[PDB]
Amino acid sequence: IDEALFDAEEKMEKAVAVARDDLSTIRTGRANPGMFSRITIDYYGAATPITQLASINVPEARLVVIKPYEANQLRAIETAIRNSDLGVNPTNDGALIRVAVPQLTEERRRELVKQAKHKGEEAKVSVRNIRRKAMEELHRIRKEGEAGEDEVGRAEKDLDKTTHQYVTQIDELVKHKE
Template identity: 45%
Template structure:
């Protein structure tokens, strides 16, 4: 493995850590209806845990309403049960063919809780990125030990890895700030 290969591989891992953070934050309820809220909810479909969007049409007809129309009527009860068991804190209303979820306005207390959750998830992403940097530096030292790169090249590679780490941590902070602003706006 060359220094360049190592850099590319570790940058890819950092991008994935950032994508994971975006996905995590998308599933947080911000007082607005979005199909992403249901991404983590699994429904029992013939004995197999299946994501809601694979067994039903999920739509957002209004800013504070999500409708779920199961492809099979037999899935209505399991869908309702899965939503009630989830940590969304939403109560499904069913008319026998379609489930409606009303998204209530967030209380100030709930907003504060969500901001804490956002900060924790952002910190987890920063830690993941720093761990990737550590792995990259270990790989760089290994390349140097194998005499595949000079001391100057490895020093430069470590500096580049630090710049990359700083860049991705800054992106984590930006993502966190945007989500925090979204949660706190009334």
């Protein structure tokens, strides 16, 4: 019962965290390091984020400079960005990567508000699915006699309580992306 609850609050935590990233990889607003965090480049057989492999430097609002902490991960990172979802054709000079935002337009931005709202929805669907796997556990606890209806019923209500908190936590994360 208690470990079921603990295992869930824990898993929703990770969903909210993955959410902040999804929503970060979107700039309703203007250029910043956060957008580059969802991108990953095979690092020694492990999918690693560039936001830890390089310094995302933002001079202008339409210009980002990327110095990979290691020279040899440069092309690797550079390619991860033209292949990403930002819509950029990163440049290279041997050490640095020159990225040109674009500035955006009245319409695409709207198509990114729809997007941010839509990926916050995926994340609330993931949460409710965590909440549901936990239910089938609390349900299976009660049925095995590892706990009385009384104790498990309480957990059900506590399970639901927590879900809303993590859901509202995703709500007031897409709120900022308006």
